[PDB]
């Protein structure tokens, strides 16, 4: 089956969408149209966030679909069939969830790593770049996979720094060293 | 834009705060989507006409248990919140009234004069607002008074095999509470509140007829939730009886509440819980049935004198199915209650009617609400009976008996005959103390087993004729003086076999 | 009225319909699904949302093609009652299955009804005696009462009841109803025959008896509303 297996629950829709549009080789188109409908979701916040709530009928749900495709005709065509599916399956809470899942799955198919460098402080751009350079230099990036790297500030990380990407982390923390100290100086 | 307008057109257009629209409904347990504002346990008016309390709140669908038939409910209906947790009219007007669970007179004496309303849920008085129990309640059943004396406040559990006239045991208490009712005892009188759950209208009606025959219903309140009546209303029925009682208790008036059958309350809560999809506790009674029962039972109390000194007394009535007490609901209740009053069916057939299984009959905290005279006389009644139990085992081996054992055996048989009573006959303590004196002082040992019943009646007649002064004194002073004891001993001797 | 639905599911004789029209029959309504073999009377018991009810089917489901048109016959099933129900043996639907032909129905009454009120009770005490000694000594009956019998059925249990019919109902002047849920067909045939013979049912002239018979062959759902049907009569 098409690259990158996602075991998403209601993400099975995204997986399906991916393989279906991969086999029709209209995945870039899909991604772009998905961005556009996702944008029109964000740009429809009243009753497009506040009526993603399940209270819609079949008939009323269908008419929400019809209003959305009146707003734009930039649709994959397979995602118009997917829109039909989501209306019929009354999948609406995991609607942006499916969008996110297809986006991740798609841009994984395209290749693009994600990453974050959670820290106790917002690091320099020089730091971002130096670390990004370092990460690309390290055999972790083997090419065919790009990178996103967001340093985030989290008070929770006490001590060190933590680099995260590719399910590979280096987690420097004070806490572990404190732990060893505490245990042995109480025993 | 135009899209948004068309979306707005098909939208709910209600914020669903303080209201919400039904979305499915089957099995009488509705679930509504909305109700963003909603207090728990609140009463919500379905547009069908039904009112329903709310027992399940879920972020999706708030589960409002209907109090009526769902035959007029349909999906997509609106329910508009009453905005009030359930409430009952409480007051003095309830005396001599049958009222249903929702607190509507079903006696057909029309609107109650029950001044005030209260809420079903009321939190029980703490340790601090209470005084120790010390106030007799006499049920006119010799065994009950002597062996398991009931105090005002206390919870004494009536337990035993179903439909052995379990209700009739309780009715006897009501009948002896006729003596206080006639009396000027008011702050010393129990207003008796009989709660009937799961029972047919005709049975209850027969009971009220019996009560009306016995001219007692000038202090009786009958709270009813018949078998026909809804399971939510049935679940709510003990707690709303409790609130009605607490108004009496609050006034400083003493009262007594019979919760018959509490076992049927458990079945009702079982139905609710499993259709609120709550996890089933053992025996399919949810694992918090205990919480419901415990809170209910602890709302009968003997208040402190700063809190008046009012006292609601409770008698829960639990059916034992096959006499099974290891069953979850009986086990739970036994722990909760401050007495157990096991009845025995075999002994019912043996002719103790009421038949109290006196070995398993306990008053957990015991005696402190027992007549002083009656404390003296029934002192060794227990010892004799205990010896009798051992002796009886030997006696049923049916061999030649130790002479000592035959003293026990002969006395023991008479004791059993003293225990035997006849349903719907209450008895005055002033004349029950003599009978126990006679028995314990072995004057009954002489007279043959058959004619003990004759002796009791005749002896009482003799005392009524001659030592009627003695009876008056026993009534007045409630403890036996040396002079009274001597008079009584002499009297028994005088009428020993006539 | 014509309120369409389709049969989404047939999970046993607890069919689920989807009333396409948002006009949704209320709970305890009755529906007719037309079939080549008669029709099926179904009774709405849940609304499961999205205009999909779940309906008890009072007839034995088979043959059903997934997505079958429905028509709403509305309300609780209204049986036909009368003096012309006397003599008759009536189906759950109310159809005279002893084929003494159609009931000339005066009143057709809803299956569901509500029990009389506490104040409406009239509490009797009039002794009814059978002439059975053990009954008389140990548990004497009362006319208008509620009598109960327990243990293994048709262990002569049925015979015991038959003896009661023989005694008590040949000493009762009023009407009498025999309703046998899960009745043994041969016993029922005998009873019907006996009743006709003892004039209790007399084919010509009046019958002081009416009959409802529910065989245990009939699907559970039918058996469930045999009781209610008899109760209406």
Q: How far is Cα B195 from Cα B69, in angstroms, rounded to an integer?
A: 23
Residues in chain B closer than 8 A to A68 (CB atoms)? 3
The tokens for B249 are 């208790």
The tokens for B321 are 């199915």
Q: How far is Cα B411 from Cα B449, in angstroms, rounded to an integer?
A: 10
Q: How far is Cα B169 from Cα A159, in angstroms, rounded to an integer?
A: 75
Domain B371-498 has CATH 1.20.150.20: yes
Per-residue burial over B17-43, b if 16 or more Cβ lie within 10 Å, else e, is eebbbbbbbbebbbbbbbbeebeebbb
Specify whether the CB–CB gap between C111 and C233 falls below 8 A: no
Q: How far is Cα B145 from Cα B150, in angstroms, rounded to an integer?
A: 7
Q: How far is Cα B273 from Cα B292, in angstroms, rounded to an integer?
A: 12
Ramachandran angles phi, psi of A79, nearest 5°: -75, -10
Task: List, by residue number, the catalytic residues of C.
Answer: 157, 183-184
Chain A nearest C-alpha distance from C69 (Å): 19
Residues 6+ apart with CB under 8 A from B407: none
Q: How far is Cα C216 from Cα C60, in angstroms, rounded to an integer?
A: 12
The tokens for C170 are 């040949």
- Find the residue in C nearest to B228 (Cα): C115
C158 is in an annotated binding site: yes
Residues in chain C closer than 8 A to B70 (CB atoms)? 27
Residues 6+ apart with CB under 8 A from B486: none
Distances (CA, A) of A69 to A110, A132, B48, B415: 27, 41, 39, 93
DSSP labels, C56-90: EESS---S--SS---EE--SS-EEEESTTSBS-EE
Residues in chain A closer than 8 A to C47 (CB atoms)? none
Quote the Cα angle for B303-B309-B310, to 5°: 80
Counting beta carbons within 10 angstroms of the beta carbon of residue B480, is it exposed (0 to 12), middle (13 to 18) or buried (19 or more)?
Answer: buried
Q: In what order do the strands lie in the sheet with A116-119?
A: A150-153, A116-119, A162-165, A168-171
Q: Give which of A57, A61, A87, A91 to mutate to test C binding, by max C Cβ within 10 Å.
A: A57
Are A58 and C22 within 8 A, CB to CB?
Answer: no
Tell me the CB-side half-sphere exposure of residue B285, using CA atoms within 13 A: 22
Resolution (A): 6.3
Domain spanning A11-110: which CATH class is it, in words? mainly alpha
Residues in chain B closer than 8 A to A42 (CB atoms)? none
Domain spanning B85-370: which CATH class is it, in words? alpha beta
Distances (CA, A) of A164 to A147, A157, B410: 11, 13, 92
- Find the residue in A nearest to C21 (Cα): A59
Domain spanning B12-84: which CATH class is it, in words? mainly beta
Specify whether the CB–CB gap between B122 and B243 falls below 8 A: yes
Q: Which of B6, B26, B15 is nearest to B78 (CA)?
A: B15
Quote the Cα angle for B167-B171-B172, to 5°: 120
Q: How far is Cα A150 from Cα B330, in angstroms, rounded to an integer?
A: 63
DSSP labels, C125-143: --EE--S-HHHHHH--EET
Q: Which of A34, A121, A145 is nearest to A79 (CA)?
A: A34
Q: According to DSSP H, which parts of B378-450 are helical?
A: 381-395, 403-419, 433-440, 443-446
Ramachandran angles phi, psi of B342, nearest 5°: -65, 135
B316 forms beta bridges with: B259
C-alpha B435: how far from chain center? 28
A146 forms beta bridges with: none
Chain B nearest C-alpha distance from A107 (Å): 30
The tokens for A134 are 């370092």
Structure determined via: cryo-EM
Q: How far is Cα A32 from Cα A110, in angstroms, rounded to an integer?
A: 13
Distances (CA, A) of A101 to A8, A26, A112: 8, 17, 14
C230 is in an annotated binding site: no
Chain C nearest C-alpha distance from A88 (Å): 11
Which contacts qualify for A46-49: CB closer than 8 Å, 24 or more apart?
A46/B4, A47/B4, A47/B7, A47/B8, A47/B11, A48/B4, A48/B7
Are B10 and A44 within 8 A, CB to CB?
Answer: no
Per-residue burial over B84-107, b if 16 or more Cβ lie within 10 Å, else e, is eebbbbbbebbbbbbbbbbbebbb
The secondary structure of residue C208, as a DSSP letter, is: S
Are B4 and A67 within 8 A, CB to CB?
Answer: yes
CATH (residue range C1-76): 2.40.10.170
Find the CB nearest A67 among B6, B23, B60.
Answer: B6
């Amino acid at each position: 089956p098409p690259p990158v297996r996602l075991f998403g629950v209601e993400g099975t829709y995204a997986t399906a969408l991916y393989q279906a549009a991969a086999k029709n080789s209209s995945i870039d188109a899909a991604f772009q149209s998905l961005q556009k409908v996702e944008s029109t979701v964000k740009k429809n916040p009243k009753l497009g966030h506040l009526l993603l709530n399940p209270a819609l009928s079949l008939k009323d749900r269908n008419s929400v679909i019809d209003a959305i495709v009146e707003t734009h005709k930039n649709l994959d065509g397979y995602v118009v069939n997917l829109l039909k599916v989501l209306s019929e399956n009354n999948r609406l809470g995991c609607f942006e969830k499916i969008a996110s899942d297809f986006g991740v799955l798609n841009d994984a198919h395209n290749g693009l790593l994600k990453g974050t460098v959670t820290s106790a402080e917002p690091l320099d751009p020089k730091s971002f770049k130096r670390i990004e350079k370092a990460l690309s230099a390290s055999k972790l990036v083997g090419q065919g996979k790009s990178l996103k790297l967001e340093n985030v500030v989290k008070p929770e990380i006490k001590g060190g720094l933590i680099v995260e990407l590719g399910d590979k982390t280096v987690d420097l923390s004070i806490s572990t060293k404190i732990q060893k100290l505490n245990k042995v100086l109480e025993d | 834009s135009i899209l948004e307008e068309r979306i707005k057109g098909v939208s709910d257009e209600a914020n669903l705060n303080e209201t919400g629209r039904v979305l499915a409904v089957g099995d009488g347990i509705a679930r509504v989507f909305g109700l963003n504002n909603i207090q728990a346990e609140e009463l919500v008016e379905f547009s069908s006409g039904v009112k329903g309390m709310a027992l399940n709140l879920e972020p999706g669908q708030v589960g409002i248990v209907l109090f009526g038939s769902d035959r007029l409910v349909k999906e997509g209906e609106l329910v508009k919140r009453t905005g009030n947790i359930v409430d009952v009219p409480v007051g003095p007007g309830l005396l001599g009234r049958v009222v249903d669970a929702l607190g509507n007179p079903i006696d057909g004496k029309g609107p109650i004069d029950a001044a005030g309303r209260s809420r079903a849920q009321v939190k029980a008085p703490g340790i601090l607002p209470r005084r120790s129990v010390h106030e007799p309640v006499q049920t006119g059943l010799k065994a009950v008074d002597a062996l398991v004396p009931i105090g005002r406040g206390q919870r004494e559990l009536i337990i035993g095999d179903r439909q052995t006239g379990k209700t009739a045991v309780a009715l006897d208490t009501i009948l002896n509470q006729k003596r206080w009712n006639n009396g000027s005892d008011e702050s010393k009188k129990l207003y008796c509140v009989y709660v009937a759950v799961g029972q047919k209208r005709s049975t209850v009606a027969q009971l009220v007829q019996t009560l009306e025959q016995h001219d007692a219903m000038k202090y009786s309140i009958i709270v009813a939730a018949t078998a026909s009546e809804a399971a939510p209303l049935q679940y709510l029925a003990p707690f709303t009886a409790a609130s009605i009682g607490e108004w009496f208790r609050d006034n400083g008036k003493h009262a007594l509440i019979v919760y018959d059958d509490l076992s049927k309350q458990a079945v009702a809560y079982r139905q609710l819980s499993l259709l609120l999809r709550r996890p089933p506790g053992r025996e399919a009674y949810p694992g918090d049935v205990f919480y419901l029962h415990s809170r209910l039972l602890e709302r009968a109390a003997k208040l402190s004198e700063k809190e008046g000194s009012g006292s609601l007394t409770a008698l829960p009535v639990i059916e034992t199915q096959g006499g099974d007490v290891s069953a979850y609901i009986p086990t739970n209740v036994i722990s909760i209650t401050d007495g157990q009053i096991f009845l025995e069916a075999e002994l019912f057939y043996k002719g103790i009617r009421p038949a109290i299984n006196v070995g398993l009959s306990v008053s957990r905290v015991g005696s402190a609400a027992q007549v002083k005279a009656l404390k003296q006389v029934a002192g060794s009644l227990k010892l004799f009976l205990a010896q009798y139990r051992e002796v009886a085992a030997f006696a049923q081996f049916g061999s030649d008996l130790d002479a000592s054992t035959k003293q026990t055996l002969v006395r023991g048989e008479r004791l059993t005959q003293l225990l035997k009573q006849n349903q719907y006959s209450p008895l005055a303590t002033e004349e029950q103390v003599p009978l126990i004196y006679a028995g314990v002082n072995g004057h009954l040992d002489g007279i043959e087993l058959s004619r003990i019943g004759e002796f009791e009646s005749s002896f009482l007649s003799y005392l009524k004729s001659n030592h009627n002064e003695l009876l008056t004194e026993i009534r007045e002073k409630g403890e036996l003086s040396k002079e009274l004891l001597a008079s009584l001993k002499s009297a028994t001797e005088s009428f020993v076999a006539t | 009225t014509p309120i369409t639905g389709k049969v989404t599911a047939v999970i046993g004789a607890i069919v689920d319909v989807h009333f396409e029209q948002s006009e949704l029959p209320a709970i305890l309504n009755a529906l007719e699904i037309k079939t080549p073999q008669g029709k099926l009377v179904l009774e709405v018991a849940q609304h499961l949302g999205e205009n999909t009810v779940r309906t008890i089917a009072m007839d034995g489901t088979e043959g059903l093609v997934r997505g079958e048109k429905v028509l709403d016959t509305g309300g609780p099933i209204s049986v036909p009652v009368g003096r012309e129900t006397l003599g008759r043996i009536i189906n759950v639907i109310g159809e005279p299955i002893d084929e003494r032909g159609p009931i000339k129905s005066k009143l057709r009454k809803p299956i569901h009804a509500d029990p009389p009120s506490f104040a409406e009770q009239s509490t009797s005490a009039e002794i009814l005696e059978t002439g059975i000694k053990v009954v008389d000594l140990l548990a004497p009956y009362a006319r208008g009462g509620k009598i109960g019998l327990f243990g293994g059925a048709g262990v002569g249990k049925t015979v015991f009841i038959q003896e009661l019919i023989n005694n008590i109902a040949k000493a009762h002047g009023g009407f009498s109803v025999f309703t046998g849920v899960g009745e043994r067909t041969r016993e029922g045939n005998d009873l019907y025959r006996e009743m006709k013979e003892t004039g209790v049912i007399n084919l010509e002239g009046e019958s002081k008896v009416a009959l409802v018979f529910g065989q245990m062959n009939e699907p559970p759902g039918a058996r469930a509303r045999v009781a209610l049907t008899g109760l209406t009569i």
